[PDB]
Amino acid sequence: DGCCSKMGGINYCDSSAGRLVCNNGFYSTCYCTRHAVMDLQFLMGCCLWHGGVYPQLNSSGLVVCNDGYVSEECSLQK
Amino acid sequence: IIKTGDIMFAVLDTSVNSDEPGPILATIVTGKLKGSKLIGSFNLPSNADKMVITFNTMSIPGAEKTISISAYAIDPNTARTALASRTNHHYLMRYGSLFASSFLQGFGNAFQSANTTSTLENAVIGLATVGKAWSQQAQQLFNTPTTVEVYSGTGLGILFTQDVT
Amino acid sequence: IIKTGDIMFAVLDTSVNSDEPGPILATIVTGKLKGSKLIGSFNLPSNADKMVITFNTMSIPGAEKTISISAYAIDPNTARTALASRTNHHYLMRYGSLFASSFLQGFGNAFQSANTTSTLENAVIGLATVGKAWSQQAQQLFNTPTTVEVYSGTGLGILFTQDVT
Amino acid sequence: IIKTGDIMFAVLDTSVNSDEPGPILATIVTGKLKGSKLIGSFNLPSNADKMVITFNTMSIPGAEKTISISAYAIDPNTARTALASRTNHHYLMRYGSLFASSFLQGFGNAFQSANTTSTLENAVIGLATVGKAWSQQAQQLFNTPTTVEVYSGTGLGILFTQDVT
Amino acid sequence: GDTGSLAGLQAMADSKYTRAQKKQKMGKIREMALKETALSVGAQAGLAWRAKIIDEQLNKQARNLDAIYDFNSLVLEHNILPPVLLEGRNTLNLADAQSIRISDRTYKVAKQAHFITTPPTWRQYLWMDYVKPEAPNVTLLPKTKAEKEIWCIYTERGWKNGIDQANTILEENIARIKEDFGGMILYRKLLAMNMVSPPYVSHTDLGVTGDGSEIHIDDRVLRITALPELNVNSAEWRAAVAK
Structure with missing residues (x-):
């Protein structure tokens, strides 16, 4: 996990870039802040592109996204 | 709205003995009601072979409400309503006390009796008269029942009895 | 609508003893009602040859309703109302306890009496006076009834008593 | 309309012992009422040479109704009210227990008394003092009645008592 | 048996088939408790796993999805989404006797044209959810090897059914996005x-x-x-006309 491996070591986490700086003047490939340029291509969660999860305690086993949509795979089966 | 007689899971943390009663609490860890709290007590069975737990005070987080569903519980992965504890606590003590006192009575009377047919007489002395009062006291205290005791870290399953709003 | 006196089937999951009454539930898997569940309790017979279950608290899915059909159950593959368990529970313990206490009484009195016609006298001592108190305690606890115990995975059939709507 | 005291036939399936009252159902297989069912219970006779069954709850298909004709039954191929079971159930147990305990009492007292005119004295010990408690408990248990239990596959004929509509 | 039915009903004279009925009535009652649990857990596991697999495969080929479903080429000049058209060819209705209505071609407008902010992508039509449930909410457990193997094969059946359900869901979503694009190009x-x-x-x-x-x-x-x-x-x- 050594981000400055075969290099000097950790100097400081530039939060304007979200990344560390090694002793030799190069940005390592590790990040250190949540605000940084990531590349996300896969996501978790359910009721995406919708109103999220409606927080009502449903007696039925199905769930409803807050735009009115209902997801069978986020719901259960019978 | 909860259907009649459904099964959920809770975790029992507050270990208590079946001799001096008190409130006991458990907490739901899954299901639609998550983190809900439950207070109740126990009852005493006629014999020490099992133990059932009475729960009636239910609360759900979020709102300032306290519902009153009275329900019972079952052991997961055994599917019996007894208790996972030990029950053999108070047989051997009273048995040993009774046998000691009786043997002492017999020692004094018979080894005094067969003197026709000093320290041995002192053994007669000691067991002869410490036998009797100890015998009647042990006969007094023999009827104390064995206690069972619930545990502090065992999860549990809950059946429902009636419904709720 | 359910006809008077028909037959359905269910599965028993919560195993129970015939010592402390408690709720027992089964679930109908076939017939007209599917997925319905049923809560009741047992009674005690005079003799240890059977065990019957009172089933009164029927709950159906679909609507928020709670019917109260009071009916009993029939064990399949024997078509009787007995129990598939052990009935030989507490014969040997009480018989051996009483017989041993009496044998102790006899050993002390007769081997003290026949001395005309030390460690042996100590045997006389011990059995002589531990016989009597253990004998009366055996007479005290001799009448504890024999239990029966249903199991946690045995199926069942149900015969009905009256009609519902 | 059913005439006063006619003959129909049915099949008994739910077998039960003559100990715990409850619903027993048979089902008519022939005649005008085909597939009708009938629920009743039993009663204990003072002598176990026979057994009778009260049959009162008749259910007919077609309409949602429940008639209440009370009648009894008779044995096919016997034309009797006796019941197919066994009646020699508990003679040998009580006779052997009583006679064994009494024999033990006699052995201890007579071979103790006959010492005038070691292990033999131990035989005196054992049978002498285990005789008495076993004897009084056998006298306690001696009046247990012999039981009968009906069979799960015995067909039956039913005569009626009054009329219906 | 009931196949050579006279022979089977003849062979049911002896008590051997009658006592053979009793040794299988226990199975015929005990079998329909664990199988539903097995089917349920197989359905949920298969639905989740096949859902994650097909979302992975859908993300694999993201470029040509945009290349075929460019709506940004299809908006009009005032940032207005064009409306939705639907059509039918050679329709007929029979109300009852002595009454027939035929019509040659028909057109129905489904969604009214309106303003829009951004060209919508395919991800609000084709992307599905994925949440792995890692808690097997199972009560019953097998006792014998026969129970174990029927548990295994019914879990396999549930796995297959979950795969099938996911495929049908994906088919419906593809149909929806295809007809929306088709209504657009029909309006054009x-x-x-x-x-x-x-x-x-x-x-x-x-x-x-x-x-x-x-x-x-x-x-x-x-x-x-x-x-x-x-x-x-x-x-x-x-x-x-065409040339």
Whole structure:
């Protein structure tokens, strides 16, 4: 996990870039802040592109996204 | 709205003995009601072979409400309503006390009796008269029942009895 | 609508003893009602040859309703109302306890009496006076009834008593 | 309309012992009422040479109704009210227990008394003092009645008592 | 057996088949408790796993999805999504006897054209959820090897059923997005052939405005007053020939 491996070591986490700086003047490939340029291509969660999860305690086993949509795979089966 | 007689899971943390009663609490860890709290007590069975737990005070987080569903519980992965504890606590003590006192009575009377047919007489002395009062006291205290005791870290399953709003 | 006196089937999951009454539930898997569940309790017979279950608290899915059909159950593959368990529970313990206490009484009195016609006298001592108190305690606890115990995975059939709507 | 005291036939399936009252159902297989069912219970006779069954709850298909004709039954191929079971159930147990305990009492007292005119004295010990408690408990248990239990596959004929509509 | 039915009913004279019925009645009652649990857990596991697999495969080929479903090429000049058209060929209805209605071609407008902010992508039509449930909510457990193997094969059946359900869901979503794009291109073709009326936009503007505390420099207001519709004049329509 050594981000400055075969290099000097950790100097400081530039939060304007979200990344560390090694002793030799190069940005390592590790990040250190949540605000940084990531590349996300896969996501978790359910009721995406919708109103999220409606927080009502449903007696039925199905769930409803807050735009009115209902997801069978986020719901259960019978 | 909860259907009649459904099964959920809770975790029992507050270990208590079946001799001096008190409130006991458990907490739901899954299901639609998550983190809900439950207070109740126990009852005493006629014999020490099992133990059932009475729960009636239910609360759900979020709102300032306290519902009153009275329900019972079952052991997961055994599917019996007894208790996972030990029950053999108070047989051997009273048995040993009774046998000691009786043997002492017999020692004094018979080894005094067969003197026709000093320290041995002192053994007669000691067991002869410490036998009797100890015998009647042990006969007094023999009827104390064995206690069972619930545990502090065992999860549990809950059946429902009636419904709720 | 359910006809008077028909037959359905269910599965028993919560195993129970015939010592402390408690709720027992089964679930109908076939017939007209599917997925319905049923809560009741047992009674005690005079003799240890059977065990019957009172089933009164029927709950159906679909609507928020709670019917109260009071009916009993029939064990399949024997078509009787007995129990598939052990009935030989507490014969040997009480018989051996009483017989041993009496044998102790006899050993002390007769081997003290026949001395005309030390460690042996100590045997006389011990059995002589531990016989009597253990004998009366055996007479005290001799009448504890024999239990029966249903199991946690045995199926069942149900015969009905009256009609519902 | 059913005439006063006619003959129909049915099949008994739910077998039960003559100990715990409850619903027993048979089902008519022939005649005008085909597939009708009938629920009743039993009663204990003072002598176990026979057994009778009260049959009162008749259910007919077609309409949602429940008639209440009370009648009894008779044995096919016997034309009797006796019941197919066994009646020699508990003679040998009580006779052997009583006679064994009494024999033990006699052995201890007579071979103790006959010492005038070691292990033999131990035989005196054992049978002498285990005789008495076993004897009084056998006298306690001696009046247990012999039981009968009906069979799960015995067909039956039913005569009626009054009329219906 | 009931196959050589006279022979089987003859062989049921002895008590051997009768006592064989009893040793399988226990199975015939105990079998329908664990199988539903097995089917349920297999269905949930298969639905989750197949859902994650097909979302992975859907993300694998993301470029050509945009290359075929470019809506940004299909918006009109006032950031207005064109409407949704639907059509039918050679329709007929039979109400009852002595009553028949036939119609040659039919068109129905489904979604009215309106303003829009961004061209919608395919991810709000084709992407599905994925949450792995890692808690097996299972009560019953097998006792013998027969129970174990029927548990295994019924879990396999549930796995297959979950796969099938996920595939059907994906099929419905593909149908939905395909017909929306088809309605778009149908509107474009009909507006080209001058069968429909195009939408109409008016815009006005004011000068500088506001109180002494708030000011707006260039204030412009755009409103749509004429929706797309269908003209019904006989001689209005224009055709097209091919070479």
